[model samples]
Target: NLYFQGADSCIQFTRHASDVLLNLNRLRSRDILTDVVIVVSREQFRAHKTVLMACSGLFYSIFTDQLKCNLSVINLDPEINPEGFCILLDFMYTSRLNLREGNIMAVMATAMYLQMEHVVDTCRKFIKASE
Candidate 1:
């Protein structure tokens, strides 16, 4: 039940983010209240990375050539491929995807989901350099 409860919160967060974007003109900085937080432990975070990999593959199939140019941050290795980034978008929009050992790349994408500049940058470095 607690897991479901968390899911409910993420769902609400999606809606809340949408509302904030929509009412940007009407709301003040103090009026905005966001209780959303991604609570994954480090292990859970690794698991989500695999899901992002799968999402990346799916996005690769759809986006084709566009994938290669999505980012220019060449750091010896680029972890978040276009498809993986697309999976990140999928999570933000739908919050539905299986996070498993094989999908760890998706987990990396998820760091981006939280809009954490540091986490996302780290994931990108790890994935890009990963063999």
Candidate 2:
């Protein structure tokens, strides 16, 4: 082992920065430009491509691969309800979630499908804590 004195340290935020470092109100503001629109069960959600890519593998593949080139609105998984995506979006932008007995399993499934580890873990924690 080795020891040193008078060293300096610094901390930096990763994409997690979006959780609190960036203003969520601005991201959700109409003033901000939205490049991708997700349509689920007749519900339309607008968000930035970068934000989506950073959060979900499904979005990352769609945007990076240009899977839906020229398509502004994408019809997402029909089985997943609009509310499920809504909660996932909320977690993506705010690092917060509301898990209830009725929605926990659905939310967990959606989060798992999206490959959002944070949301998935949160869902697990909520489930265990509720027991």
Q: Which residue ranges in model 1 land beyond 4 Å of their true spot?
A: 1-79, 109-131
Model 2 lDDT per residue over 43-117, tens place:
988877777788898777777775564567777888877788898887777767877898899899888878888
TM-score of 1: 0.26
lDDT scores for all predictions? 0.40, 0.75
The positional error of residue 21 in candidate 2, measured at the CA in angstroms, is 5.4
RMSD of 1: 16.5
Window of ten residues with lowest summed lDDT in model 2: 1-10
TM-score of each: 0.26, 0.75
| TM-score for predicted model 2 compared with the true structure | 0.75
Clashes of 2: 0
Per-residue lDDT of candidate 1, residues 1-131 (tens digit): 22233544552333664554435413322333321221232211111222233334432332344653343221212434544544454453344433444655665664554344544665666666765
